[PDB]
């Protein structure tokens, strides 16, 4: 639309007994000239929790303005209630939403188990070459994977897929795949999967030599 709705954090770690707070900052003041301020909160079909800062049917949430800075506080989280929260505006045409805050369960920090796999003989046989790197059971979700070929970072052609929170471990697993052509895969000899995570000052580095 026009007004930008910046939400933080992207993922808010929660503990099922404790409070929780999220923020929503607008590009422009939501204070309307009719006196009212049209800020809502949705939970994800999507259904809204709050209008203007009052609840209306949820309830246990808050609920706080104003101007360009807004917050949503849960006095005590439950597993209800685990999901994405979007803020919303109508100053203001057109209505815009925020990027959403996803709530996940807070667990002890864990480093990923990194495994790197070269292209199989069958795929090279078909003229393609994919290098696969598994980053398994880590917390929190935030993680950074970097691919290096002969010591030089490769950005193009990398697809990353994350699981959701496990619900048994409360960990995440992610997959990183670097797809080359077969011709350029044989053009290099060192393939490196480098993972940077909060659980270490130094990146976990797994590699193989073609």
């Amino acid at each position: 639309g026009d007004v930008v709705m910046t939400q933080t954090p992207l993922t808010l770690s929660v503990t099922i007994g404790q409070p929780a707070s999220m923020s929503c900052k607008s590009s422009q003041s939501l204070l309307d000239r009719d006196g009212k301020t049209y800020l809502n909160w949705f939970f994800w079909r999507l259904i809204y929790l709050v209008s203007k800062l009052d609840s209306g049917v949820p309830d246990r949430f808050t609920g706080g303005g104003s101007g360009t800075d807004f917050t949503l506080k849960i006095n005590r989280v439950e597993a209800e209630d685990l999901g994405i929260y979007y803020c919303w505006q109508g100053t203001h045409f057109p209505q815009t939403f925020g990027g959403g805050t996803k709530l996940d369960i807070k667990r002890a920090d864990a480093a990923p188990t990194v495994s790197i796999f070269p292209p199989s003989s069958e795929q090279l046989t078909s003229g393609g070459a994919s290098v696969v790197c598994f980053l398994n059971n880590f917390y929190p979700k935030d993680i950074n994977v970097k691919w290096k070929i002969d010591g030089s970072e490769r950005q193009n052609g990398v697809l990353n897929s994350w699981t959701d929170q496990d619900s048994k471990d409360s960990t995440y697993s992610m997959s990183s795949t670097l797809t080359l052509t077969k011709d350029e895969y044989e053009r290099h000899n060192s393939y490196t999967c480098e993972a940077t995570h909060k659980t270490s000052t130094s990146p976990i580095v797994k590699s193989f030599n073609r």
Binding site: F42, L46, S115, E122, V132, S173
Partner: protein
């Protein structure tokens, strides 16, 4: 009260798609019907609105050139037509008055394509790469499992699955749209 949308729609790039939103349990002309877009990990976006009682429509300008909104009193359904479709229109589209469950639109020129199954072999971690199939979805079983959400790339899907054993392992991939089952033994 409820709004009925189909679960999924598909379209090749450059064509048009008509998304339906059937109403029941309330008088159809008493509520404006809004449409919303949600790209994966991209917030929600308001597309526009229609007043069923007179067919007046209004649009977010970002979507006005691509979206045509109509409503049918006789059948209590609303429609959004999306034109000149691009890979950036692959998204979930909701109608709202209460919401529909959303329609997942996938833009792709691909035909039904069985996956290629590639074994990923060196606690030992094994996996297999399931690449270049269409459409979703696919069932990978093993004989600690992590199955990773597929990503749409150039009209085709790729996904991966991993298994961790303590130290014969095979992964089984079933693609019902093409009625294929592949089993790959690992080195």
């Amino acid at each position: 009260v409820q709004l009925q949308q189909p679960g999924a729609e598909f379209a090749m790039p450059g064509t048009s798609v008509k998304l339906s939103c059937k109403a029941a349990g309330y008088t159809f002309t008493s509520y404006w019907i809004h449409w919303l877009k949600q790209r994966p990990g991209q917030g929600l976006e308001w597309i526009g609105e229609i007043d069923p009682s007179d067919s007046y429509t209004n649009h977010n300008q970002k979507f006005r050139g691509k979206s045509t909104l109509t409503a049918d009193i006789s059948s209590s359904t609303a429609y959004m037509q999306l034109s000149s479709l691009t890979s950036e229109d692959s998204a979930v589209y909701y109608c709202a008055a209460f919401w529909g469950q959303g329609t997942t639109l996938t833009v792709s020129s691909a035909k039904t394509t069985p996956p290629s199954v590639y074994p990923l072999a060196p606690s030992v971690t094994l996996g297999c790469l399931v690449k270049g199939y269409f459409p979703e979805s696919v069932t990978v079983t093993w004989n600690s499992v992590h199955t990773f959400p597929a990503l749409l790339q150039s009209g085709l899907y790729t996904m991966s699955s991993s298994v961790t054993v303590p130290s014969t392992v095979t992964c089984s991939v079933a693609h019902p749209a093409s009625s294929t089952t592949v089993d790959k033994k690992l080195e």
